[PDB]
Amino acid sequence: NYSYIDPTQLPYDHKWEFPRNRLSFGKTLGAGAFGKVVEATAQGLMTVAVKMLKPSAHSTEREALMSELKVLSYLGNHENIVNLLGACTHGGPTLVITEYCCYGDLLNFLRRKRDEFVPYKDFLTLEHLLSFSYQVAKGMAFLASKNCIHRDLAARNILLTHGNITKICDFGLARDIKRLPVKWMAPESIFNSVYTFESDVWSYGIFLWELFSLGSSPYPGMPVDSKFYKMIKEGFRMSSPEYAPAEMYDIMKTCWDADPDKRPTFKQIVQDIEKQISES
Ligand SMILES: CN(C)[C@@](C)(c1ccc(F)cc1)c1cnc(N2CCN(c3ncnn4cc(-c5cnn(C)c5)cc34)CC2)nc1
Numbered sequence: 001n002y003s004y005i006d007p008t009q010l011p012y013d014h015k016w017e018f019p020r021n022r023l024s025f026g027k028t029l030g031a032g033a034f035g036k037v038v039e040a041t042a043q044g045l046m047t048v049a050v051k052m053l054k055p056s057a058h059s060t061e062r063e064a065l066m067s068e069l070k071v072l073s074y075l076g077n078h079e080n081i082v083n084l085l086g087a088c089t090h091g092g093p094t095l096v097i098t099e100y101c102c103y104g105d106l107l108n109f110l111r112r113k114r115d116e117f118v119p120y121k122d123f124l125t126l127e128h129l130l131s132f133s134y135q136v137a138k139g140m141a142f143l144a145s146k147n148c149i150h151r152d153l154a155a156r157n158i159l160l161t162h163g164n165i166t167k168i169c170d171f172g173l174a175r176d177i178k179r180l181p182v183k184w185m186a187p188e189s190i191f192n193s194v195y196t197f198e199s200d201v202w203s204y205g206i207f208l209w210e211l212f213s214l215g216s217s218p219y220p221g222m223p224v225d226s227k228f229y230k231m232i233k234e235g236f237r238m239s240s241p242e243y244a245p246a247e248m249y250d251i252m253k254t255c256w257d258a259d260p261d262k263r264p265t266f267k268q269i270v271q272d273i274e275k276q277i278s279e280s
Helices: 059-075 106-112 126-145 187-192 197-211 226-233 246-255 265-278
Strands: 023-031 035-042 049-054 084-088 096-099 159-163 165-168
Touching: 049 059, 059 084, 059 246, 096 187, 106 159, 106 197, 126 165, 126 197, 159 265, 187 197, 187 226, 197 246, 197 265, 246 265
Parallel strands: none
Antiparallel strands: 023 035, 035 049, 049 096, 084 096, 159 165
16 A cells, blocks of 8 residues: 655656747757757746757667656756756657756867866865865765766767856666666676666766776776776776866775675765865
8 A cells, every 4th residue: 555656657747848830940959879968048938958859769669758857857856957947748749948057068168178077277286176076075965865866978979168066967777776888887787787875876987987097998998898898897997087086086996895785875974074174
């Protein structure tokens, strides 16, 4: 007589419905063979992003897009996620309208800032990197508090907008807890297809390594092959990235514990980074 409420089973909430012909589409923000995200103007909702599938997409991607709409509808608003603003469902393919983040993804932002960075006007600083790590931890703590896992946390899925605010995007693989980004995945996810709050924490560790290397690719010179899998399973881990303070590398190392039970929670990570910020 007692059941979990699965957000993907709930009905669409028509409060999100927006007239389709009041969108005016602009530049491409992301694209693949079966879908794209475009900038648009939305009369009566301002600048927004619109996620949509291409006519070649199969029914599985279409179901996945509606599921993502339903997860975002359930989660509610948070400063550190790219929030749902509206949807178009009647008489056409699903359009998911989200917030537009004017500075794009953090991976590309960090990479173009390498010549304008001090590791301590218009410069990226260590204070900014600490802030970004704090905000992403706050956003992931929010997801976990709603029993949600993201499953593709990476610097490429963190966007930057005004006020130096970072926002987690792309909830297409996000799941409620009752082809794959292998180098960001926890070993139990690779080996046993198991995803948990603790495997999101592993990915956050990889994200921190990206952050404090200003966007370097993880495990450089190590292709995904049988040798990569054995080395991760037997305990190989990346070294401290070049700009990480010792306290942040300590967080990374615990995020990468082979035992999920020994990894920190996002709530614990938030409180850790909070103490580091106050010490500054
Ligand atoms: C990977 N998948 C396979 C797809 C293709 C997909 C899957 C299913 C679909 F049905 C449709 C598409 C995909 C999903 N997601 C995204 N990204 C793109 C970035 N995007 C943004 N969202 C809000 N604002 N914003 C501002 C900027 C910005 C500002 N300056 N510059 C230079 C860029 C970028 C964004 C968030 C999501 N791209 C591709």
